[PDB]
C-alpha cells in the first residue's frame, strides 16, 4: 500500500589521461529499473564497501582505467581486480561487485570475476551516453565492468543491463572515445578514473580541454551534434546558438581569459560548420552563417596570438583569406594578424609580404607603414649578421 520515493542518484567520474585532467562525467543511475546494478555502481563510486580482494582496502573505481575504446560504439572500464594496480596482460579479464565475499575469492582460484549478479533492465541501446554492464557473455554475469555507449548499438540489445545515462560531461566521453588505440581497442595513453564519488550540483563540473562556462547564456553542448536544444534543420536556432557562443567568447576575451575565449570561438566555429545551410536551402541564413564564420576566424587569429599559439593563429587567418568575397577591411585584419604571427616566429619575408598586402587592402592603416619599416630593418640587421 505504501511506497517511499528515492530519486535516481547522481555519481561522478573524474577523467585524467596520463595524469592530465580532462574533466568530470556526471551520471544519473536508474534506481527503479535496475536497483541491484545501480547499488553496485553507486557504491563503487562512493568507495565505502570493504574489499574481499585485499585486507586494508575498499572497492572503488578510483584509479581504474578505460581498457577498451571503440570509436562509434562504446568506452569500457571497471576491471578493479587487474586494472588498477601494477604488474598485466590480465587487464580486462577481471571484475568484482560489492556482493562478492572473501570465501568466493579464496575457493575459486581459476576465476577472476567475483560477486556476479543478475541482469536487470535488458533494453535497447538507442541513444549515445547510455550506461550498461559488461558481462561475460551469458546471463547474470555482471560484476564491476561497465561501458558508456557513444552511438546507437543495436547489436547489444537485450544482452546488457541498462542502468544509467550521462548527464554532464558528454564531451569528456567523446574525448576518451577519440583516444588512439591498438587493434584490440586498448588505448595507447593511460585513461584513468582519477577520482569518483557521489555527486551534487554544488561540487561543479570541471572541464579542462574546452569551456563549459555558461557566461553569456552558453547552455549548448561542446559537441554540436550532441546538443539537444533544437532540431538538426532548425537554422534560425542554430544561428542563434553560434552567435551566443561567439558572444560568450568575447565576454571571456574582455576578462583576459584567453584560453576559454579560444575554446568558445572554436565551439562557435564547430556549430557553424555543423549547421550551416547551403545557399539553395536557406539563402539569407547561409549568408548570415558565412559572415559570422569570417568574424570567428578573425577572433581566433587574435586570441591565439595572445596565447603564443602562432601556428594556430596563422591557420585560422589563412582559412579566412581563402574564403570567397571577403570584404577588404576583413582581409586587412587577417593579413595584419597573420603577419604579426609570422613576425613572432621570425619569418621576416612572410611577415613583410602580409603587412604589404595589409596596406594594399586598407591604405588608411595608421600603424602599418611603421610596421613595414620595422620589418625592413630586421631584415637588414639579419643581412649584417650574415655578412659578419
Amino acid at each position: 500500500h505504501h511506497h517511499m520515493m528515492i530519486q535516481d542518484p547522481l555519481v561522478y567520474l573524474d577523467i585524467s589521461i596520463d595524469k592530465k585532467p580532462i574533466g568530470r562525467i556526471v551520471c544519473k543511475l536508474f534506481r527503479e529499473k535496475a536497483p541491484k546494478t545501480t547499488e553496485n555502481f553507486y557504491k563503487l563510486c562512493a568507495g565505502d564497501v570493504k574489499s574481499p580482494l585485499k585486507d586494508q582496502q575498499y572497492l572503488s573505481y578510483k584509479g581504474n582505467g578505460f581498457h577498451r575504446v571503440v570509436k562509434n560504439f562504446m568506452i569500457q572500464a571497471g576491471d578493479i581486480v587487474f586494472g588498477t594496480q601494477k604488474d598485466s596482460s590480465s587487464v580486462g579479464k577481471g571484475g568484482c561487485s560489492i556482493y562478492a565475499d572473501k570465501e568466493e575469492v579464496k575457493t575459486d582460484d581459476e576465476s577472476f570475476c567475483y560477486g556476479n549478479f543478475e541482469d536487470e533492465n535488458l533494453g535497447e541501446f538507442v541513444e549515445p551516453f547510455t550506461l550498461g554492464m559488461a558481462n561475460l557473455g551469458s546471463p547474470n554475469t555482471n560484476n564491476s565492468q561497465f561501458f558508456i555507449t557513444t552511438y546507437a548499438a543495436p547489436h547489444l540489445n537485450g544482452k546488457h543491463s541498462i542502468f544509467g545515462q550521462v548527464v554532464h560531461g558528454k564531451s569528456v566521453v567523446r574525448t576518451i572515445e577519440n583516444c588512439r588505440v591498438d587493434s584490440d581497442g586498448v588505448p595507447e595513453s593511460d585513461v584513468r578514473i582519477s577520482d569518483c564519488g557521489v555527486w551534487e550540483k554544488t561540487m561543479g563540473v570541471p572541464l579542462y580541454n574546452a569551456s563549459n562556462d555558461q557566461i553569456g547564456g552558453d547552455v549548448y553542448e561542446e559537441y554540436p551534434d550532441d546538443d539537444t536544444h533544437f532540431g538538426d534543420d532548425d537554422f534560425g536556432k542554430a544561428l542563434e546558438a553560434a552567435n551566443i557562443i561567439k558572444e560568450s567568447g568575447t565576454l571571456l576575451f574582455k576578462k583576459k581569459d584567453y584560453s576559454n575565449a579560444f575554446f568558445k570561438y572554436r565551439k562557435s566555429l564547430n556549430y557553424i560548420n555543423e549547421y550551416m545551410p547551403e545557399p539553395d536551402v536557406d539563402k539569407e541564413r547561409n549568408i548570415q552563417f558565412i559572415n559570422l564564420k569570417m568574424k570567428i576566424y578573425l577572433n581566433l587569429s587574435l586570441v591565439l596570438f595572445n596565447l603564443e599559439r602562432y601556428d594556430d593563429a596563422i591557420m585560422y587567418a589563412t582559412y579566412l583569406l581563402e574564403m570567397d568575397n571577403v570584404p577588404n577591411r576583413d582581409q586587412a585584419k587577417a593579413y595584419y594578424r597573420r603577419g604579426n604571427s609570422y613576425l613572432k616566429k621570425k619569418r621576416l619575408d612572410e611577415a613583410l609580404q602580409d603587412y604589404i598586402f595589409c596596406k594594399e587592402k586598407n591604405p588608411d592603416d595608421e600603424v602599418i607603414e611603421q610596421r613595414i619599416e620595422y620589418v625592413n630593418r630586421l631584415i637588414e640587421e639579419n643581412k649584417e649578421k650574415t655578412r659578419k
Copy 2:
C-alpha cells in the same frame, strides 16, 4: 681527363597539416650517385618545368599531399597527377616526372604515370630519413612519387632508387609519421607540402611545434633517439645534453618566450627519460638525472601556468609529487604551483588542499597564509551565491 665539381644540392619542403604550419624539411640530394633522380626532384621542388598535364601550369610539389604514412617504415608523397587538385579515389595512382611530354599524356589514356625513368643507386635502407623513389613495382618505373624512411627498411633493399637524405627537420618527418591513418595508411588529416624550393642557409629552418633555437648551445635533435652527437650509453654526454637543453629553456623563459621555454623543458625531459641510467649501471649519474628531472617538472609547472595551460601544469606538478624522496622545499613549490593552477580553474577545494600542504612543507612561506585566506573567502562567497 677533366671533371667539374657540383655539390649535392639542398632543397626544402614546408609542411602544413590542415593549413597549420609544422615546419621545414631540408634534404640533401645525391647528385653523383643518382643524377637523373636528383635532377627530377630538384626541379619538382623548384617548380620551373612546364607541365605536360595542363596548359597554364608548372610541375611542382607545392600543394601536394603525403598520401601514405606507415609508422616505423616511411612516409610517401608526390602524386602530382591526382594528389594536388580537387575532386579522388585516384590519389596515389598517378605521377609525372620532368621527363614526361605532352605526346605521352595524350596517347596513353589508360596510364596515369608519365615520364617513367631509370632506377639509380639501388642500395640498402639502413638509416632513417633516407629519400627513395616509389615505383610501380618493376624496374625503371620512377616518376614523381617518393618516400622518406623513418626506420631501417631492409625489405626495400635493391628495389628503390636512393637519392638523398634529410639534413634539417627530422622532427617534422616524425610529426608526419605519427599522424593518425586509416587501415590503408591514408592520413585522416590533410598533410601538405605547402611550399618547396631550392634551399640555402640564409632562408632558415622554421619549426612551429617545438623549438630549434640554438640559444644556450642547444645543438641537439628534438627527438633524443634521432640525435647523433653521442653514443646511446654515454651517460655523461647525455646528462650534459639534458642540462644544456634545460638552460636553453631558462634563457628563453627570461626573455618571456614562454612557448619556446616550454618546448625546451619538454625536450630536456625527453632526453632524461631516454638516457637516464639505472642505479646499478651508473650510481652517481642516476642521482644527477633524477635531480634534474625534479627541476624540469617544477619549471614545466610554472611556464605552463604562464601559457594558460593549467591542465598541463597540473600534470607535471603531479609527476613531481609522485616521485620518491622529493626534498620538502621542492614539494612546497609543486603544491604551490599545482594550487595556483587549480585556483585558475576555480577548483577551490583542490587549490585549498594544495596550499595547505604547501604550508606544512615550508612553514616560513610568506605569501601562503594570505593565499589560504583568499581561497577560504572565495569558498564563502560561493556558499553565499548558493544560498541566494
